[PDB]
Amino acid sequence: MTEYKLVVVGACGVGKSALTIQLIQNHFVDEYDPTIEDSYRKQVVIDGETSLLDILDTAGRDQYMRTGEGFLLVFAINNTKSFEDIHHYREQIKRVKDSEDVPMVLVGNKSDLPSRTVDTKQAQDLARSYGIPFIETSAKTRQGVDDAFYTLVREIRKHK
Numbered sequence: 001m002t003e004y005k006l007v008v009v010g011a012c013g014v015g016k017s018a019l020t021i022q023l024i025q026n027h028f029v030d031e032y033d034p035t036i037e038d039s040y041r042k043q044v045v046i047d048g049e050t051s052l053l054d055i056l057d058t059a060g061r062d063q064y065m066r067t068g069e070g071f072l073l074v075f076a077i078n079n080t081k082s083f084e085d086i087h088h089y090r091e092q093i094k095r096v097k098d099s100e101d102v103p104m105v106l107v108g109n110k111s112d113l114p115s116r117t118v119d120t121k122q123a124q125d126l127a128r129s130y131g132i133p134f135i136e137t138s139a140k141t142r143q144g145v146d147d148a149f150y151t152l153v154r155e156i157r158k159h160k
């Protein structure tokens with residue numbers, strides 16, 4: 001039985017809240033208040049081991065981020081600016097965590113949408129350059145949502 005502090009980061013409107021609420025409440029919330037930043041808790045079993053997840057859904061400071069054990073780097077597959085922002089979020093995290101190996105997962109959300117502007121290959125190549133996994137999600141359909149969070153827990157376990 002182990003605890004994990006997870007932090008969900010990424011540009012405004014990529015689906016941080018939608019992803020987190022899907023994980024916790026098992027339904028899709030359209031346009032969750034973009035200014036609400038809160039922590040959520042969920043107990044799960046991953047690879048046989050019971051895990052309590054403490055999840056911070058960041059919104060509109062260093063202290064909270066330093067206590068994070070792993071980070072979901074979320075962009076939206078129809079929003080190139082959010083994908084370009086990922087390297088900046090990565091840099092901010094490394095600086096506050098002291099540029100050490102920090103468990104992270106790259107998450108490409110909104111996979112249900114047709115107007116794609118970032119391809120999986122691009123995201124895989126970015127994830128490869130950081131030595132982290134890439135997971136594609138849709139908070140709307142729930143595809144990949146558990147995978148993103150569970151993969152992060154696995155990355156934290158490998159680090160610990």
Ligand SMILES: *CCC(=O)N1CCN(c2nnc(-c3ccccc3)c3cc(-c4c(O)cccc4F)c(Cl)cc23)CC1
Nearest residue numbers: 009010011012013034058059060065088089092093096
């Ligand atoms: C629409 C409201 C929303 O969802 N917000 C979350 C994203 N917020 C935000 N914007 N910019 C930066 C940033 C990124 C790179 C360089 C400067 C500023 C944000 C950074 C962080 C952050 C910090 O400050 C430290 C460690 C890890 C981080 F992700 C956060 Cl938490 C949020 C940032 C705008 C509001």
Ligand SMILES: Nc1nc2c(ncn2[C@@H]2O[C@H](COP(=O)(O)OP(=O)(O)O)[C@@H](O)[C@H]2O)c(=O)[nH]1
Nearest residue numbers: 012013014015016017018030031110138139140
């Ligand atoms: N089509 C689609 N829309 C999404 C998805 N995830 C979030 N959204 C929508 O994208 C917008 C931003 O989502 P939100 O969770 O508020 O993003 P946040 O600012 O990162 O917390 C909202 O209008 C959501 O309903 C998704 O997977 N697919």
Ligand SMILES: [Mg+2]
Nearest residue numbers: 016017034059
């Ligand atoms: Mg939000």
